[model samples]
Each structure stands twice: as structure tokens, then as C-alpha cells.
Target: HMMSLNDFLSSVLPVSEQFEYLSLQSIPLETHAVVTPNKDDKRVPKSTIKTQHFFSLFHQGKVFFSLEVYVYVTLWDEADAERLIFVSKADTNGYCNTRVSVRDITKIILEFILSIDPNYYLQKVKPAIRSYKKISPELISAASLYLSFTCPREILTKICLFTRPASQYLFPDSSKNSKKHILNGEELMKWWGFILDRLLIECFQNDTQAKLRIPGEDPARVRSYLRGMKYPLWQVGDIFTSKENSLAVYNIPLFPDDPKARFIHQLAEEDRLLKVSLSSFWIELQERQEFKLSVTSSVMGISGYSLATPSLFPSSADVIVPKSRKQFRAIKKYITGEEYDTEEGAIEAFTNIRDFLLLRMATNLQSLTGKREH
Candidate 1:
């Protein structure tokens, strides 16, 4: 069911007695890629970007503090079902709007695969192709996005028995950044589309303009710009990292049955689940080893751990969860001087983190309900 834009806004921007409303609008739309890849900038807010600029002006006496707000929440539909949903600002960006991010394209494709239903691609792509009488970009885009994570490689070669491609072919494996793994946003998207076409070419067969948009041929910059461009096709034994790196997008929890409803659900569940075990999400070893490599690297969100910014007294009483191994280790060091060098030390360290959570909880419950800690 489509959630009411009014309800979402009313809940998010709570009313104030002195503050009265003025200009407002809402537009609803859809797309799989937007939710999956647009993680950080997420197109989730240009209002943030525009609002920031406007507020900067406000500080300089260029504009007033009170202003307008519009929200766009896109609901990506499967032919039969409305699937991925994302909320963002519409009609705002100036330049970079034309480009879909390459890093986003890569992760979005993988996310699409994992989240999409197993047969959703086959059911819809065929129907659209039959009606259109040819493979449209929608067919390619949906098939690519839905297919990315649905049919995990395990399902292939085992159940479906579709012959698997070489490991080198599937992932851009490299021990060296010097080697290659770079593909611009558009190039990666177009190829991901074609590769979906290639897979479904067994099902059937599957853009550019403004120089950037024109379907310039195989050049990496543009298939149109091949003169100085090349794609160094992947090589064997080159990857030390597992494909799990692509699939590690487990950090963001699942969207609620209705997204707006989630505002409360997460405040309850995330903290409830977050402190259940070790500092990090208990990722298994082969998966765990890949993260360890980034332990000392400058790269972020890789091996590093991210804790809740600050859970303070009086104003705050909340879980302080750690997101990665490096962060977990450091927190442990602060508590015990070493990162759990022994079994009992590891056990006690976890106990320490658990106490941090319960202390916050007790403080909260005591204040909220006059309840005493057991």
C-alpha cells in the first residue's frame, strides 16, 4: 500500500506551537537502483543540499530562516508488485544529475540481485518484451537490477545448473589498485545492463547522448570515446577478496512493511538487536578476514568500526553499537587495555559492552516509567 506523504511529513517534521506551515508539495516515484546504490548522497535529500545553501545565506542575512520543503518518495515497482522504495528531493540538482554514480551502479546491481525475488525478473521482462515487441531499456534495467543478487552464484551450478562464469570474469579481482577496477558511473551501468542482456540473451538479447549521453561505443569513458580508452578484462587468481565484499551491504536494516512506519520500529529493533552479540555484526570468518585487511588503511567503512557518536548522560541514553572490527577492538582496548587476548577477557569485554547498553536502558526506563533496575 502507498503510504500517505502527508502522514510521513507530519511525523518527521513535528509541529511546533509557534511555527505555522506555508508552502509544501509531494511527488511519488520509483526505481531499484536509487535505493540500492544511492546510499550516502542517496538522492534522498537535495533539500539538505539546497537547505544548507539557503541556511548559509540566512546566516549572512541573505534569506529568512523559515522556508519551504517538498519531499519525493519513489516506489520502484515490479510488474506485479511494488518493491524498493526511496525518499528524496526532486528537480533540484544543477550539473551532476545527468550521471548515475559508477560506485553506486556497482553496489546497486549487487543489491538488486540480493533483494529482488527469484523469478520476478523472468515474469516481468518477458511480458514487457512481448508487449513492446522488442527489448526496451526498462527490460534491461529491471532485469539487471532484479537479477543482481537474486540468483546468488550458489544457486547457479547447483540447482539451476546454469554454467558459472570464471571468478575473474564475475568480479574485478585485484591485489593492486594499479591493476584496475575502475569504471565510471555510466560505463558500469550500461555494461551491467548488457551483461543482464547477455544472461537473458539466453532468455533473449538486450546509452548515451550529449556526448555524455550518446551511445558512444566500447570506450570505457564512452563506448563513444574509444580512442584513448580500454577495458582491461579481468584475469584469473587476481582477487584476494571474496565476492562478499560486494554483498556486505547488510549494515542498513530492512525497510519496514511501510517505510514511514519504520521510524519507530528501528528505534526499537536496531538497539534491541544491536547489542545481542559481539561489537560487530557477527560476520563469519572468510567474510571476517576480508574486513580485517582494512584495519590499518585510510579507507573508511571498510575495516574500521563506527560506534554510535556519543551516548551521554541527561540528554542521551542509547545503545553504543560498533560497526566494524577496528572500532570494536579500540572500544575493547579502552575498557580492558588489550583487545580480549584471553577467553575470560573476551567474555568480560562483551559483558562490559552489554552493561553499557543495559545501563542506558535502565536509565531510560527508570526515567520513562519510574521502573527500578533489577
Candidate 2:
């Protein structure tokens, strides 16, 4: 026999410490215009029934916010399901914004799930695929929502692939005797364990110090070599009026491995004043066999604003023709003399330039910080 709603809540509510299921009460809905709490009212008709129900919810601790949900039941008796009308929420001040609809409820549940266990969904599906089998889109969809809540869309898709059972079937087999893939569940788990271990080690190592710690290497000279090896993207604010504009747009993560570090590309679209067309720039760079590439924009009333590396830029120049006329000249004027085409434009340009340089410096320092564990 199926469990009733009361029984289900009693059993499941305690499973999560984050949620405190409060009380459930009935709301009378009848043919009579006037209503009272007493069921023995003489005005009430026999066919009329209480169809509306309210469920109160609170946070596990002292409630900073309180919530209640309204549901419409088809029958007041033993019914399998009910239609959710909407949810109501109020802050500590008792000020409520708008009624939380079914769609809005997803945000609340998703956030709660993330707070408890970010990888709960991933762990959920792992048990089902102990052996080789095909996975359904429905199973992926189950975990995909939680996976996507905090991470990027690309990351979401990437992680979902690992959790799905059918992903192993798609792997190409190299052995002549094997019909499909040879690796089993235990092997795949071990493979993932090794991969994660390597990643963990990489995270702990200081690349800058590690490079300098080579055997028989001069510490002072090694430091100098490492500094010089750390190339700039390109001379920002350089005058490049022509030459097919070799641009290399890279999302240089400030702390490539650190999840906590902020990045340039992570800025909101509205926050950014400039954009680059990198595909054409990359093609031009390759075609011309250019050694350097850059990021360009009209925001500074000039072309280049930053440099790119081969690994980052995979790409270029010099002419001390009096430093030429560059965007920084306008920025300098704004900073020292208050002379600018527009005050707002000048301020924004300087802000972006400062942030760009800081990010580059931080990235370099992060590399240098990686050293011997001992």
C-alpha cells in the first residue's frame, strides 16, 4: 500500500536537517458564502468539503524567514496527489515580496540542496551503474539541475557525462579481442581516483618555486630566467593602426586552479565595456606567422589594451617612436590633468586597465608560488 501524505512527511522531513517541516492545516472551501472553524454550522451544505490545505515551513534553526505553501486536493479523503497553487514567504521584518510560484520554488529547493551537499545528485546515480549499462536522458536530467546550480554550463555538461552509465559504452576499444570497452566499474572508479589524485597534487604544488628548484640550478639566475619566461600578453596601449590586427582572446584565469579566485572573463556582460573578435585575429596571426596577439577595443579610442601568451596567447613588437599616440595617453591626461574626451569614459577606461594589470600580476605570482613541498 502507498503511504499517505502525513506518513511520508513524518518519515522524510527528519532526513534533512536544513528543513524544519512546521504544521499542516486545512482550509475550508464550500458552497456557503459565510464560513466558520466549527464543522457543525447549520448553514454548511452536505456536499461542501474542505479542498485547500496549507503547509508551513521553517529553517532548521531560529527562523530568519518563514514559508507556507497552498495545495488544492481533488478529494478531501485518501487521494494520491494534489495541485500546488503557490508558496508564500516572509522575511524577519514580515515584509513579503511576491508570491512564490511553482517555478520560484525550484530556486529555494536547489539552493537548499546545494547547501547540504553540492554533489548529492552525482552520488545518487553512482550506485545504479555498478555494472555496464546504458543511461537515459531522464537520469542525467535528475543530476544536471543540481550540478548546474553553482558551476558554469560547460562544467555542468562535463560533470553530467561522468555520472551517466552509457558514457563508457561510447569509449573506443583498442584491444582486438574486446567487442566494446574492456574496463569495468572497478577499473573506471580507479581511473577517476588516480585522475583526481593528480589534480589534487597539481593544486598543492607551487609552479613558480617548483620551476626554480631544478637540480644544479643557480637560485638567483633561475629566478631571473623564470621572470623573463613570464612574458606579457603584449605591450598594452601600443599603436597598431594596421597589419590585419592579430588578436588572441584568452580567458586567463587569475588563479587557474583556485576556485575562489576571480577572473577577467567572469565579469558580467554589462560590467565589461570592451569585446574582441578572436577567430579572425587568430586566423590572421597564423596566416602571417605572427609571434604575438592582443585584445583590442574602441572603448579607449585605440586598438590594443592587453597582451596574449602562446599558451594563453599562442601568439608578437617594438618601435619607440615617442611611445606613439596610445589610449593610455588619454588615461594619463584624465589621471594627472583632468583632461579627457569624457569624464565617465576616461574613468571606466582607467578602471578596466588597472584591473587587467592586477589580474596579470596575480596570475604570475600564483605560478611563482608553486614550490617544493618540503
Candidate 3:
């Protein structure tokens, strides 16, 4: 069964260190006096604030109701702040973490505050409140690293959502200049080069088709089109362009000179194929033991599209196969430059490939078991 509110509160409230309660009450109506020929007269005015009652969540320190128009929050900041604030028509006391989560709660507080005093909330309380960003620095670095390589914004954004706390903490400011701290001009390109190289290996590592997915279309494509697509990465020629501001391919070399490039290129050149083996790629990445994003990126770039040596090749002739039929069709659309698919599809594709490759590496013993069994 899903967690009941009572159960959820029991587990969370005990560990929390800070508890805040904001109450909402009726404001009295205003009146003005008028000077008359006979005598002084007064008229009372009606107001909206008086209609609601001030309500609270806690009667004592025990049972708290998530009712009434109030901002009830309990925060624990021993290390990172774990907080809960409720913003409802009735009671709202909830918990999450960091200033980022606090800001989210504050958004509701602002709404309630505006109801009480629209002019006041924006001027007074809003400024005092920290601007919360849902992304962390390491995540930003990962994102920027991916972006530098020209990963689709849609794909990166989705990935970012899953790592909000981490990214926000590592680089809290959302300003453009602050974000640029991850990488500079050439550094961006270099960082991207690394991610792009590694992604290509994983995407095609378990493929059955000889075709490669390249980007091009004559449509006013929406970013949401690639939401469902997986395994979007593919290489056409040696060079590719970035989606940001029609960024053209300059001296930035992607695959031609890289290690894996030679093997992939040989396949395309000789047999007109674009195939990669996850099993094979996994082995090579391990042998190199170059796991850091920058090192991995650098290593992948130097090798072209191949994971191992220029002379070595996959022992098996079986073509790389995608894990699913849906992925296979998506790859077809990707190669053909379908209007529905966008750069985001490529981003999602690379992410999936990266994840799958990691999973494959973890359970690689099964492959050895199969070999022994055979």
C-alpha cells in the first residue's frame, strides 16, 4: 500500500531538527469618518481578509494536521537541510531538503502571502528568500560536459531533473556566467568531444544494423518530440555539428583520429557497416581504466569511434542488436532524419547507452558463465 500521511509523518518528523509554523487570521475592516453639516458620520468598508480563520497544524508537539491556510514547515540541517512545508487552502507543513526545496515551499508561501498582502510579499519577504535552483554543480558539470558535446537540451534537462539536489548544490547560481565555470570555449568542445566519443561506443555496441543515425530535417520541430525515444546516438561521417546556434564543425575532430573511429570507419568503408559490441567495448574501457569523465572523453576521442586498438577487432561477427524493437524503429527515424525526432532523442539515446553499459559491466560475469557453459 502507498504510504499514508500519518505513517509518512511519523518517520520524517522525528529526524527533523527545525519546525516552523505560519498562521493565517482575519484582518479587521477599515473605516473613514466624513464631515457633515449636522454631525460627524462614519462608514465601514468590507474586506476579503476577514472571511478566513487563522488555523494551525500542531496543537502540541505530537499530532499535526496538514490543514488550514498556513505555512507549517519542519527542517533538519545537521548536514543538508531536510525540510517540509505545506501550502494548502487549509494546513500545509511538509518536508524536503536544501534551500532549493525551501524555495519550492516558499513559492506556496508567496502565493499565500500575496493573498494576505500582494504588495508586501514581493517587496519584503521575496527578497529575504533565497533563489532556489533545482540543479547541483556536479550535475551541472555533467550536463555542461554533455552540452559541450552537443547533447540535446531536452535529454539533458530530463537527466537533470533526476539529479536536482546534486546539481543545485555543486553550482547553485543559475546565472550564465556562473554556469560557464564548468568549461570554457575550447574546454567545452573538448569536454563534449569526450562525452560524444563514449556515447557513440555504447549506442552502437549492441547493434544488429549497419545503418548509422545522423541528424537533418526540414521541419519546425518541437523539443518534446524526442521524449519517448531511447538510444538516439549514431555517427554518420567523421564530423558532426552542434545544435546550439547552428554551431558548425570547425577543427574539432570527433571520430576520424579517435581509436574507435578507425574500427567503425573500417566497418563502414569495407563492409559499409556501423556496428559495435557492448561486450567488446566494456572490456576495452576496463583495460584502459580511464573512468573519469574528462579522461574517458579524452581517451574515447583519440581512438576515433573504436574502444580498443586500431589493429584489434571484435572476435564475433554477430552484428550489434538493440535491446528493443521500439529502439530499432527509433534508430531508423534517427538515421532518416524524421521530423518528429530532435537532438533530445540523441541525448536520451546516449544516456540510455551509458546506463546500459554500466549495467552490462556490473553483471559481466554472466557472459563468462555462458562461455564456460558452451
Assess each prediction's global lDDT (C-alpha) against the native: 0.22, 0.23, 0.23
In terms of lDDT, which candidate is strongest?
A: 3
- Write down the lDDT that model 3 would get: 0.23
TM-scores, all models, native as reference: 0.16, 0.16, 0.14
The predicted structure with the larger lDDT, 1 or 3, is 3
User: Which stretches of candidate 2 lie above 4 Å from their native place?
Assistant: 1-18, 27-48, 69-374
Query: Per-residue error at 365 for model 1, in Å?
Result: 40
Give the lDDT of residue 33 in candidate 1: 25
Predict model 1's lDDT versus the native. Answer: 0.22
Q: How many clashes would you count in candidate 2?
A: 15
Which scores greater on TM-score, model 1 or model 3? 1
Q: List candidate 1 stretches off by more than 4 Å.
A: 1-80, 84-176, 184-190, 203-374
